[PDB]
Design a protein around this ligand. Structure first.
Ligand SMILES: [Ca+2]
Lengths: 221, 223
């Protein structure tokens, strides 16, 4: 009683360690997780970290730790030529492609300009298990580090965008709100220098709660 | 910042449940695992399950269970027009793309012909945690099921290639070896209907024990 539309998985190999890139704050962002079946192709879209940034550096990493510096370095390259735009607007697609020969191809492409750059990384046993074990021993500190960096980066963006809004609003912003917002901005700046995720979240919320008039002001444009 | 070549994640959003397709034996094969940051595009190449198969069905699934039937079905489509070839030779690339708006694009492309079909899927917190808890409660049964399917598919491939080798050997195969191989093939066929991975593995080894001359004939023919 057979049917004839079935699809079969081709199982040739799996990756021994995670593969990814370094991102803002010294974090390893994974593109291909440990144990992914190969051949495979994974991409994710990234952006710039400051206004009018013209280039990014892709640092290719191998390992299970969240701090980039605690992983193995496989290679690096730049993608130049990113057209001037606000932080976070350019769309840079980073693709990790592993072929049947086990060769890793990494590329970064600007989705807007089409500019592309790429590298090829050519295809341990006790070192692998050592690295897996080093990660388990630091799993808690690594999670806390990753969450802190994410929170800091979100807080830095909010700091910068809010200051920009204050400047554009000018005399349209009531003095009481401006005082409240400036105080909240300074408090968030101080929190961002620390290592306490909860304090940064609280200062971000305290800032949003006093900044509601900025959005309304922008709309009268 | 003191330096100016930094790269940042575009969004923080992640997928709530794993996304994949149904594969031979009723298994969900994941293309994008749960908690993957978006936008993301993941592709993998699959193939046909029988010789000269001309079409495949892509059944898109969402969830954490290994049996396809235990996950949510999000849609299906066929890719037809596949040129005749041995099982496992056609290269069908399946791509899952989730854009910044959270919209899922699934496509299947025949790498030979460039023929392509696709669907767009537009995508529930208590149901999510429900589905997660049930996958953990059933982790062992699910793994046993997946491992059984993998062993069955291997045994079926072996049944088929051995029968092919026997037909190619013809009169070169001694009658006694042919009998023993036929008997071992029947035993394996019977084991494949069961639910015991070890019995199937044992029948595969027993087949290797009686196929030595068949393999020697096979090698000399390859020569
Ligand atoms: Ca960086």
């Amino acid at each position: 009683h057979h049917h004839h539309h079935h699809i079969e998985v081709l199982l040739l190999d799996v990756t021994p360690l995670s593969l990814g890139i370094e991102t803002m704050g010294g974090v390893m962002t994974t593109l291909i997780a440990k144990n992914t079946t190969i051949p495979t192709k994974h991409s994710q879209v990234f952006s710039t970290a400051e206004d009018n940034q013209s280039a990014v550096t892709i640092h290719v990493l191998q390992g299970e730790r969240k701090r980039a510096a605690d992983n193995k370095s496989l290679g690096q390259f730049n993608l130049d030529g990113i057209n001037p735009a606000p932080r976070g607007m350019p769309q840079i697609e980073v693709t990790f492609d592993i072929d049947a020969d086990g060769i890793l191809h990494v590329s970064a492409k600007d989705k807007n300009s089409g500019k592309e750059q790429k590298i090829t990384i050519k295809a341990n046993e006790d070192e692998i298990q050592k690295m897996v074990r080093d990660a388990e021993a630091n799993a808690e500190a690594d999670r806390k580090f990753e969450e802190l960096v994410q929170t800091r980066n979100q807080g830095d963006h909010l700091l910068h965008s809010t200051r920009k809004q204050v400047e554009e609003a000018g005399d349209k912003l009531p003095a009481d709100d401006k005082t409240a917002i400036e105080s909240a901005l300074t408090a968030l700046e101080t929190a961002l220098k620390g290592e306490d995720k909860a304090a940064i979240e609280a200062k971000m919320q305290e800032l949003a709660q006093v900044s509601q008039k900025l959005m309304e002001i922008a709309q009268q444009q």
